[PDB]
């Protein structure tokens, strides 16, 4: 379900990033020895364009995505795409394909996929000197259920997604490749998603396969938010950073610290952990109802979406839809 067009930009070592153009969406060509096809030298991003009540098309923290694509590129030995070029590509695609952006203002938006891959031929294991950047778009958010249906999660004990010193803080295809097998063991146990544990001690909660994770401890004015601190092997999600800000705004104490599977299980059983949710671009916030850790399955509270979870989701979606004021300057005009 792609849109009509795509943006293409080439990299060559003498020229840097050049030949930026908008062209029809269609097949691309690679030499059989193109580095991406052998040594996976690639990085990507994910963000949305939203249609507002007034007809404008907006982005949410697109500057953060621009900068994160550069951070990912750096870790993967890929020449950085300048932020201004990243942002301009978004505007260029929206200019031609804006009719594809869904109506205001519910769960529906246009998902934008900026991505870079090594195109240089040659089987030597080294950073490429030729790359391509593409920007493609896909409508998203239909049949969402208000984004509020709780999920069950499988704790991966046999597989490890990334490790300290590795590529887990980069949005890099290889992290996702590594996760595919565990994702199947999750389904076989009837689970919707996988929670990943740290590589060194195999205990500390990292993130889900495509989302960060938050815990709510206590309730009322006493309610606290805790999320795994940036370990160097989990993704610094933009939704995650936004929700830390909104929690501060709302007067909740927040903690970025290490939290292990034992604490989670123990504190959920004792009722100290009152809610758990996952967060990310696509779903915004997804409540977590139940957890399978080895043989044992445990429920979070009554398995229903939590009050803090749903309050934070209301606020963030409202800002993104232009129905709440944008205190932090997250929203920008794309078209």
Ligand X SMILES: Cc1ncc(COP(=O)(O)O)c(CN)c1O
Q: Residues 229, 257: contact at Cβ < 8 Å?
A: yes
Q: Name the minimum Å distance from CB 81 to ligand X.
A: 17
Instruction: Give CA separation, 251 vs 226, 238, 307, 330, in Å.
Output: 14, 20, 15, 20
Q: List the structure tokens of 261.
A: 């599977």
39 is in an annotated binding site: no
Does residue number 166 form part of the binding site for ligand X (CB under 6 A)? Answer: no
Cα–Cα dist 166/168, whole Å:
6
Does residue number 207 form part of the binding site for ligand X (CB under 6 A)? Answer: yes
* Beta-bridge partners for 10: 18, 132
For residue 238, give the nearest of 89, 48, 73 by alpha carbon: 48
Q: List the structure tokens of 264.
A: 């989670």
Q: Name the minimum Å distance from CB 123 to ligand X.
A: 12
Q: Stretches 130-138, 187-195, 197-205, 209-217: which one binds ligand X (CB under 6 A)?
A: 209-217
Q: Between 12 and 282, whose beta carbon lies closer to ligand X? A: 282
* Partner from ligand X, a copy of itself, none binding residue 76, C-beta < 5-8 Å depending on class: a copy of itself
* Partner from a copy of itself, ligand X, none binding residue 335, C-beta < 5-8 Å depending on class: none
Which SS3 state, helix, strand or coil, does residue 22 take?
A: strand
Task: State the residues that interact with a copy of itself by CB under 8 A.
Answer: 2, 6, 25-33, 36-42, 44, 75-77, 111, 113, 115, 117, 123, 125-127, 134, 136, 138, 158-167, 172-181, 183-184, 199-200, 202, 209-210
Residues 214-253 that bind ligand X (CB under 6 A): 235, 237-240
- Residue carrying structure tokens 């043989």: 295
Contact pattern for ligand X over residues 22 through 61, marking x by CB under 6 A: ------------------------x---------------
Q: Residues 209, 179: contact at Cβ < 8 Å?
A: yes
Q: Residues 310, 243: contact at Cβ < 8 Å?
A: no
Residue 307: how many other CB atoms lie within 10 Å: 14
Q: Which residues are annotated as a binding site for pyridoxal 5'-phosphate?
A: 68, 176, 238-239, 281
State the residues that interact with ligand X by CB under 6 A: 46, 171, 207, 210-212, 235, 237-240, 280-281
Q: Which residues are annotated as a binding site?
A: 68, 176, 238-239, 281
């Amino acid at each position: 379900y792609h849109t009509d067009h795509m943006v293409s930009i080439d990299y060559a070592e003498g020229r840097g990033w050049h030949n930026a153009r908008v062209i029809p969406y269609g097949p691309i060509e690679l030499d059989p020895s193109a580095i991406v096809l052998h040594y996976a030298q690639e990085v990507f991003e994910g963000l949305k364009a939203y249609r507002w009540a007034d007809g404008s098309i907006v982005s949410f923290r697109a500057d953060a995505n621009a900068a994160r694509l550069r951070s990912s590129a750096r870790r993967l030995a890929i020449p950085e795409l300048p932020d201004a070029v990243f942002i301009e590509s978004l505007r260029q695609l929206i200019a031609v394909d804006k009719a594809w952006v869904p109506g205001a203002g519910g769960e529906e938006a246009l998902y934008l996929r900026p991505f870079i891959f090594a195109t240089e031929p040659g089987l030597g294991v080294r950073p490429a000197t030729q790359y391509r950047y593409l920007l493609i778009a896909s409508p998203a958010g239909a049949y969402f259920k208000g984004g509020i249906a709780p999920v069950s999660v499988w704790v991966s004990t046999e597989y490890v997604r990334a490790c300290p010193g590795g590529t887990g803080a980069a949005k890099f295809g290889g992290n996702y490749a590594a996760s595919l097998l565990a994702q199947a063991e999750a389904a076989e146990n009837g689970c919707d998603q996988v929670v990943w544990l740290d590589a060194v001690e195999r205990r500390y909660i990292e993130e889900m396969g495509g989302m960060n994770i938050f815990f709510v401890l206590g309730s009322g004015g006493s309610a606290r938010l805790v999320t795994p601190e940036l370990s160097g092997s989990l993704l610094p999600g933009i939704t995650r950073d936004s929700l830390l800000q909104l929690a501060i705004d709302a007067g909740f104490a927040v903690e970025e610290r290490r939290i292990d599977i034992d604490e989670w299980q123990k504190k959920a059983a004792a009722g100290e952990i009152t809610e758990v949710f996952a967060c990310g671009t696509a779903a915004v916030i997804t409540p977590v109802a139940r957890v399978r850790h080895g043989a044992s399955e445990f429920r979070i509270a009554d398995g229903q979406p939590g009050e803090v979870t749903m309050a934070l989701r209301d606020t963030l979606t409202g800002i993104q839809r232009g129905t709440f004021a944008d205190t932090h300057g997250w929203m920008a005009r794309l078209g």
